Every structure is written in C-alpha cells, then in structure tokens.
Design a protein around this ligand. Sequence first.
Ligand SMILES: CN[C@H]1[C@H]2O[C@@](C[C@H](N)C(=O)O)(C(=O)O)C[C@H]2OC[C@H]1O
Ligand SMILES: [Cl-]
Length: 257
Amino acid sequence: GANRTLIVTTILEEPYVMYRKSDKPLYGNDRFEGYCLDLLKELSNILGFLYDVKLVPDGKYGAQNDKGEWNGMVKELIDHRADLAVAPLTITYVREKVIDFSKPFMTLGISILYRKGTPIDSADDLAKQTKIEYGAVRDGSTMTFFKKSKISTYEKMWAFMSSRQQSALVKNSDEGIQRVLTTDYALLMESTSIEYVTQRNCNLTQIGGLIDSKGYGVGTPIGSPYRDKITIAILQLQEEGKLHMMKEKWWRGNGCP
Ligand SMILES: CN[C@H]1[C@H]2O[C@@](C[C@H](N)C(=O)O)(C(=O)O)C[C@H]2OC[C@H]1O
Ligand SMILES: [Cl-]
C-alpha cells in the first residue's frame, strides 16, 4: 500500500555503513551506523517513509558483466528488489542508462592510496613499473573507469591491474586497504574514502591529485517518484548545514602530523 516500508539496498563501507558495536546482539536497522544511515534517517523524516536496510546480496556496487547484465546494488534497483540505494554510489553515464540518481550529496574523484615516503608521485610513476602492484575494488566505478579508459596511461594501468598472478582487483575496500598496509600495493579509490583512511592511518597518503570528478547520489529504479523528492530533500539538508554536520561527524579525527 501507500505506506509500505521501503527496501534500501546498501553495502558495508567505512564510514558510510558499518556494524554498530554492542556487547549484546543487535537486530534490524539498529545493526548499522554511519554517514549513509544518518542520511537515510534524515530523508525518511523529511519524506515520511519507513525503511528496511538490506546489505546487497552479492557484496558489489555494480558493473555490467560479460553477458551485458548488471550486478550489485545497481541490479537490485533494476529488478525492483530495492526501492532506494543509499550508499556511496557513484553517478556515472552508463549507470544513468539503467537506474536513476538523485542530485549528488557528496563529490569525489579517483586517486591513489599508497604508503608515505616513496618516490611514487603520480599514476604515471605506477604505470611505468611492475614491482609495486596496484589495483581497485572489483565491480565498482573505479574498476570500470580503468577498464573503459582511452587514455594511454590508464589503459596500461588497466592491463596490469587486471592481469596479476594474485588478482590485484580486490573484493572490497577493507581487503584493498589491508593490502596497502601489509604488502607493496597501491589502491585506486575515491578521494572521500582516501581522506577517511589516511587520517586513520598516518603512514598512508594520497598519491597525486584527483584523476576524475564525480558525485555520489541516491539510486532509484528508473521512473521512481522518489528520485526528485530525494533531490529536493538533499538540497534542504545542504542549506540547513546538515550535510556538513554529517561529514564532520564521520570524518572526525585528530589529523596526522
Ligand atoms: C566508497 N569509496 C570506496 C568504494 O568505491 C567503489 C565503488 C563506487 N563508489 C561505485 O559506486 O561503484 C569504487 O569503485 O571506488 C568501490 C570501493 O573502492 C574503494 C573506495 O573508492
Ligand atoms: Cl581505515
């Protein structure tokens, strides 16, 4: 009916969506905390809906496979299994063909996460060598950027990152970050996430600048009436200062000297 609970697809990703720590078992939406849960609470209040947070069944953001089919949160929306995707879901032209997005709630670009104190200063520096491995999270927009790029350097990088003996394309962010911390490996990832990670890991740094410029939006199925309503709500949250409050809350830290 009109007041049905909305199914919200999302994915574990620090600090957007995390398991809340508790001495006792937690259940339902209370299992989760993070920037996206705060955003979802605000949207639910403004737009007057109830919601059920469900982790994406395949643990993927979404890419089109060799059969031409989508996976991840994008597929959950296409197949109407979810009403909304509230996650750091990158707005891209290819995704806009199959799902709708609100206007962006946060901006980002791809860059490089690596350790401090090395001679590696740019993507070019990584691309021209083979000792240091590098890659990206599988089945997301960063992977797709490299896979589809026609820029010489990024074509070379794609060829390398998709052809290592131990796959350099990692399952999720946490796996990639651990690889940067424990082996000679650099992770291509989004600047939002790099800022979070580098503040919590003072031996790590961003290498170079941003190599593209994009936004995150709330995803909906094509034609959903919630898309425009969520755009309006995001504008309200921005004007009120609430997006700034949420960013400060979840990117809080002591800095790195
Ligand atoms: C939310 N940012 C993180 C995550 O973003 C993804 C997913 C992306 N935000 C998407 O919507 O596909 C990326 O491809 O960079 C996967 C994962 O990669 C590490 C880091 O960039
Ligand atoms: Cl971290």
